[PDB]
């Protein structure tokens, strides 16, 4: 499989020991952080020393070119002592070249091996950190799941790619210095003038690296923010599309994209300037050197010395080809490792089954949310926790589990035992249903059947494509909320632990499913195993079954004991409870996106640049062919034109890249956000967010540099071929076999590369997904204490990905070795042809040194072409989304007919409405006919899967209608533009989607509302006091996903978000699912007293709420059964509504 040295386990252990030694060294000092760079050096240095040794030997052998060219030229110009023989020197040059290529490839192999080992070790380190970091980092905005995913995907790979190129940073300097030292021998003091111009690259490149570092840090910041906004959009597309807020968030994302593109333009300008200097300081150095020699040494250059010096200049230029690449990658890797080091230095976690005494706990801030927690959980009994929204129940659970730092008090666990946690926000991995329910336990069909029948999952799973073996979660078929929650509770029940913490498992479930889970699942199945159970529920009707009762108010336990104990001590609380219960082509498109003028300007400028650059060498050959003002003047004008064209060609390609990136991302976003909701339901969010993050990163930052390096290399190779063939017209014949050979090796490479490439992208996706599903749901993994198994799985997956990437790199090295030997053969053939069949004593030299150039740059041509193919793949992925269906916003009703206040009355008539989600699917709604008067209170009830939500989303045309007319105030909604319909009606969904920013930003993203109405709304939604007490008032922050607030408070914010709009029709779809009964009653009273004029349709979670409603509808499999007042339906014998009321009460 993977050799032991290359396993992620050993590399991780080595890097971890190095980093722990660094942490010791840091503990030695105050304000001296541990450094990843020294840890990595100490751990993985010896391989890098080996590769550096190979590189130095390669450079020393590369200096054989100058000597051999000098000898060959001198001999063409004019035993065993025949080593001067031209052919002998040519053969020695060929052998030196093959040996240099062997050493270079050995160095590359060692470096890539080390880079892959280090990538594995770093991913292991940050994965263990994920398993260690406290959730208060994500809850308070310290960081986000997206940032951690960015670490795993972009930043670690950026460090790895830099480490591939690392030996250059110290090898390129040396190779340059040696060159100067040799030039000085041939040319005397004149060569010191060129040495100064070359030395100036060090200050210049350091300055440019400073500027690039600043620009890259800014780009990374704005990329983080833009991806945050994009992810929040994609996750909440339903709410945005329902509120007509799509374009507002699109505009904000575009603003952040503009800032990111300004930072990218600074980075491109300074990258384009570094390329200009690396190219034009050699032109200037050649000028200075040879002009000075012309006017200092009276003796002219003999051809041998001239060509030796020119070859030394070529050997200097080769280092500077890759200097821009290495400075770019080093500047990116420095930022990357700053981010990694910030991540790895963060906050980390610190009878009677559980006994908490005098416990003050806080959510990683400094102010206590729980105080005076004196509780005990009796062993093997049912403990129920009851409290209004935001009273510390989930806080209490995650405190016992130790997930929030303790300020005072103790918890005793008569080290922690494995506790089965069913979190309030259910978490599902990307495995099958069976894997999520078993969750790392031996399959037992008897227990599995018992659990599945206690959670009523059987009818729901047999409706799935592959019953019980269908992939679930992100990247798989998306289950409804109730299905996901019941799968999570099934997971909790199936495990063989003794303590089961269930945090409100009945939020999404209806009355029948909830009662079934309570009777068969908790009271019967768990009490048979005699397992401790802690329930956090608002279902007060279940308090009769409770064995122990904890009551929580305002963060502190108000009273604790059996029901009778509470009745005897706190008569008030018991009476309150009783009252409440009432008892390719893509490449051409990328090039053309410039506009047919940037492309042709680029290509013509590059060709002219190389024409002049090669004319410089031809001119030097002709000039030194003597053994003057005219030659100096011609040389100067050629060099100046070369510098100018270098500047132009540098700018053009980067500008092309900028424009292409901007247009690609803009089209992608403005087409994704206009798609139908069916597209987002069907397509996994991963397949879209990856386009937005990884493919966008490639398009922005990876394609322009690869393309420019490819063009430079290919034109250097073509220039060398042209010069050689001109010097020796016979070489063209020799170009027939070799060229053909090229075409073959590449061919073979492809049929493997492609294959391996697919593998390397199919084995990386699991790994990344793991880092996701552990970053999310971390508290669950640490509640079951399955951290060891997840570490093992991460090591396995990273080993697999490393095997795949190692084979990919091995194929690349195969092709590179083959092309290097082909280039050595090209050099040999050109050398022989020039020695034997060239006219002048100067053309032999040009042919030889340009053959050397061919060998030097053909390798880069091949490598960069392969990389550019793999990246045009990503451009193809991004372009694929411009063929989406676009929701029809146009509308047909003339805007003149639509009044200025269209829902002015709020009377809805639904005539023969039949709704389906996709064509050739079951009609969820069947010939429903409804008539709600203006200013009428309508309550719709039914069992899960009865089309309540379909009937709700019908008004906003998020479900495709087969037949039926929905007339709101005399207008068929089918004619209106989508926005005038979706903006003038307000709907409160069941899932509390919440965006990052202030409270204001979540209540009115347009900022078109005064603070007074925001306070009115937050008063109706019962959140006025909590916001008044919050640090920043209405400007208080809301971290991504609303994690810093309770679930109930998230829902109440979602209710205020609807109350602000103040439209005439309010569709409340199970809005009080997570709200407790105490808050829910007062909230309903206030909403009825405030919206008494408007028309509200309430799809109710409990029938008690819709008892005081003007009209009641009961749905059953898409059919309205009873249509009358609640009194009539109650008085009907054996009626459905009457049965609902008994169960709910
Ligand atoms: C000119 C000849 C003799 C050698 C060609 C390369 C070298 C000049 C070396 C010596 C100094 C090196 C540069 C000096 C330091 C930096 C900055 C470094 O990034 C940072 O320093 C962080 C940014 C910051 O300081 O805020 C990235 C590598 C780089 C460009 C180095 C790249 C390789 C350089 C140019
Ligand atoms: N992840 C979190 N990070 C920081 N503060 C939090 C977090 N969750 C809740 N809080 C704060 O803790 C207080 C208690 O909320 P908690 O999380 O215990 O809700 P809960 O009572 O379990 O929820 P509900 O009963 O509505 O389902 C709230 O004021 C909230 O501000
Ligand atoms: N996103 C969806 N795409 C296709 N069909 C769905 C989707 N959601 C629900 N359904 C189907 O429509 C029917 C009614 O679902 P729904 O309207 O969600 O019921 P409820 O009113 O209880 O929410 C169900 O039988 C279900 O199979
Ligand atoms: C004028 C010369 C000495 O200086 C430069 C400057 C920039 C670049 C580039 N890229 C290349 C070169 C030399 N060439 C031209 C073809 C191969 C090579 O090394 C030039 O012969
Ligand atoms: Mg809760
Ligand atoms: Mg529903």
Swiss-Prot record:
Domain of life of the native organism: Eukaryota
ABC transporter domain boundaries: 354-579, 908-1111
Binding site for ATP 1: 387-394
Gene Ontology annotations for the cellular component aspect, listed alphabetically: acrosomal vesicle; cytoplasm; inward rectifying potassium channel; membrane; mitochondrion; plasma membrane; protein-containing complex; sarcolemma
Record-level Gene Ontology MF annotations: ABC-type transporter activity; ATP binding; ATP hydrolysis activity; ATPase-coupled monoatomic cation transmembrane transporter activity; ATPase-coupled transmembrane transporter activity; heterocyclic compound binding; identical protein binding; potassium channel activator activity
Bilayer topology term: Multi-pass membrane protein
Residue numbers on the Cytoplasmic membrane side: 107-158, 212-266, 328-595, 652-723, 863-1111
The entry's keywords: ATP-binding, Glycoprotein, Membrane, Nucleotide-binding, Receptor, Repeat, Transmembrane, Transmembrane helix, Transport
KW Transmembrane (keyword) present: yes
GO aspect biological process, one term: vascular process in circulatory system
Compartmental location: Membrane
Membrane-crossing residue ranges in chain numbering: 53-73, 86-106, 159-179, 191-211, 267-287, 307-327, 596-616, 631-651, 724-744, 842-862
Domain annotation ABC transmembrane type-1: ranges: 48-332, 599-870
UniProt-annotated binding residues for ATP 2: 942-949
Summary of the tissues where the protein is detected: Expressed at high levels in heart, skeletal muscle and ovary. Moderate levels are found in brain, tongue and pancreatic islets. Low levels are found in lung, testis and adrenal gland. Expressed at very low levels in stomach, colon, thyroid and pituitary.
Subunit structure: Interacts with KCNJ11. Interacts with KCNJ8.
Function field: Subunit of ATP-sensitive potassium channels (KATP). Can form cardiac and smooth muscle-type KATP channels with KCNJ11. KCNJ11 forms the channel pore while ABCC9 is required for activation and regulation. Can form a sulfonylurea-sensitive but ATP-insensitive potassium channel with KCNJ8.
Family: Belongs to the ABC transporter superfamily. ABCC family. Conjugate transporter (TC 3.A.1.208) subfamily.
Protein name, UniProt field: ATP-binding cassette sub-family C member 9
Species of origin: Rattus norvegicus (Rat)
Classification of source organism: Eukaryota, Metazoa, Chordata, Craniata, Vertebrata
Portion of the full-length sequence here: 250 to 1511 of 1545
